[PDB]
Amino acid sequence: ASMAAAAAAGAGPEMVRGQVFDVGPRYTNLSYIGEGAYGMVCSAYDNVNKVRVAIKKISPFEHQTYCQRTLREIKILLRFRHENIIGINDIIRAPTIEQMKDVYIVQDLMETDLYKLLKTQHLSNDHICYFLYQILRGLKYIHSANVLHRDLKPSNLLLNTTCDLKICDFGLARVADPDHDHTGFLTEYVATRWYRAPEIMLNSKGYTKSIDIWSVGCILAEMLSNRPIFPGKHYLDQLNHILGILGSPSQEDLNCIINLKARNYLLSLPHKNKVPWNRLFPNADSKALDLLDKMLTFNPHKRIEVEQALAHPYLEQYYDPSDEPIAEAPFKFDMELDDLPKEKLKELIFEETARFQPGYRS
Template sequence: MSSSTEKPKLVYPEFLSARYTLLRELGQGAYGIVSAARDKKTGTDVAIKKVHNVFQKPILAKRALREIKLLRHFAGHENITSILDMETADNMNFNEIYISQELMEADLHQIIRSEQPLSDAHYQYFIYQICRGLKYIHSANVLHRDLKPGNLLVNADCELKICDFGLARGLTDSQDVGFMTEYVATRWYRAPEIMLAFRNYTKAIDMWSVGCILAELLGGKPLFKGRDYVDQLNQILGVLGTPDDATLSRIGSDRAQMYIRSLPKMKVVPWQHLYPKASPNALDLLNRLLQFDPEKRLTVEQALAHPYLESYHDSEDEPSHPQLFDFSFEVVDNIDEMKAMISDEIKEFKRKIAGGASDGLVLPTVPKPQELSGNIRSPQEPVERDYRHEDHNGPMDIDEELKMKGH
């Protein structure tokens, strides 16, 4: 996160600067730049995400369209980031989209790396909010597929919002066609069944990621930091032990299955050895989330009801979405068609907002614990990020990687 004294590298186009005053640049990624701005109309500070080169490739246009549609579908939930405004150039020649959202102090990655003291109450509240938002997502038959600390935004009052739906997919998507498309990021938080090509994928892939995030909160660093797919698998096996035969038989990759069977049988490492200061309930939840077999992993509803989260759990205040998300647009691959669809989404959004209507549902608010209010600090200096888990330049699947390594 840039210091407010630095000169911003970003310049807003005229159609954007008419309403927003650029305050500072917050960060850059592969798909765009995020900046803090002041809304001249409301006087509030917002985050503006500039998504650039949207129509350079069909995969980028699809990702932008997916993100906008999903954020609109989930609008109104406190633990999912919402769109406040969207802007593009007036003509259809636009190649950039500016999305205005709530301004949050930091992401969870930055909070963990900043080494500010966090208590078990912080861990509980963060995990509770992740699960509360994820319940809403899963109830619409959507898999987020990219849950990680960097995609969890946090403010000074410990309020947390899930962001970045660019890799999301529907539960009913074909598992053989398209499910792995774009799925090259975030190796450290990826469920083993994704790497090992299990016969089918379920909402359990997101629950594995929640377990990895809990482990990172408890230990202050990622649990499984694999250099590549094979190393990632080895690190998982080194902690969870060798899976039983029934689980191994469901691995779709024959080469990966043979590789695991060829290894010496590994024992489970007790969680209390890895996290001796963690509470028994925290370790029990961690154990139930980080199960190698996805069928043994807790669902998000079961996680919310776990004793570790009982201080916040209230089934009446953990809504499900009333509608399944429509992924039918995924069949469109023509850039011009997707540009028209994005333009239509923006126009419909603006019509609803101009008419005084909410773009989402009116939902109950999550209670905020008084003892945690106002005690999260935004990191004053940029936090160095390790992108090795995100920038994967090697083989695209574990089969290819095992073959390359001579297995």
């Protein structure tokens, strides 16, 4: 019948900023948190466990790319398990695929995020250091499963009252099995502009995991000055912003560009001189600035890998390889085969959420 109507018998559908949340009798007392193009996250009260949770309503079935991203986030998160990464505790959707217009994702509730924190507070070095370590600890696990986040930014860094950090919004994430070649196969417009690596623009569809390391450095820079490091208006201005600090690329740097048209654009650019970090960031710990420089390296292949970053001096107090785990089974090439129509993707989403359905009985 109608679960909402059955819920309505006690307490049922609730309205939040023009969006109805049919999260059933179990979840009530929803409060708006944030929203995206096709989704909205709310805090809510789990009446069964008598605790508050976060609920993400997803409405992707109209568009094929939304469906692709929804299935990727659900499949990656359901198999991921890590301290510094958000997980899926429950999934809510209609019993029949015909009625499935929205999909509800229930996650651990986090009080705030790094983006919110930096607007109101300046972080002490020990806070920056600990936050940065946690970011990389989750990132090590992510890259260990052959997964690229592709949207690391302050807003995607959840924070609770006990200085615990988790990474969320894996909708832009994707599998890239290392054995296969992905040059020219990867989605072109990825990451947020200010945290977008140079090679994403310069080598469209030919980037690697190193784009995440670049984002971390931007976040680290943002923590250090409570201000974005590369506030580009558009991709041209963004490229100018990147080269404003790093300076004109080296010839070795120029040789890693495989887009010849792009390389010639760089050659056509006026010479700009590299800016030292200490002048830009006077009060920053040099140990941090040594690592900051190393994750902002123009060359992606020579960019500091996630394991190497953890072992950098600046995190030596928190560095412990025996408690920086990896996934038991990384993701293979078969998991990236989602170049499908949305009607098929909708079926795949429906199958993947079947375990959460009431009385599944495996």
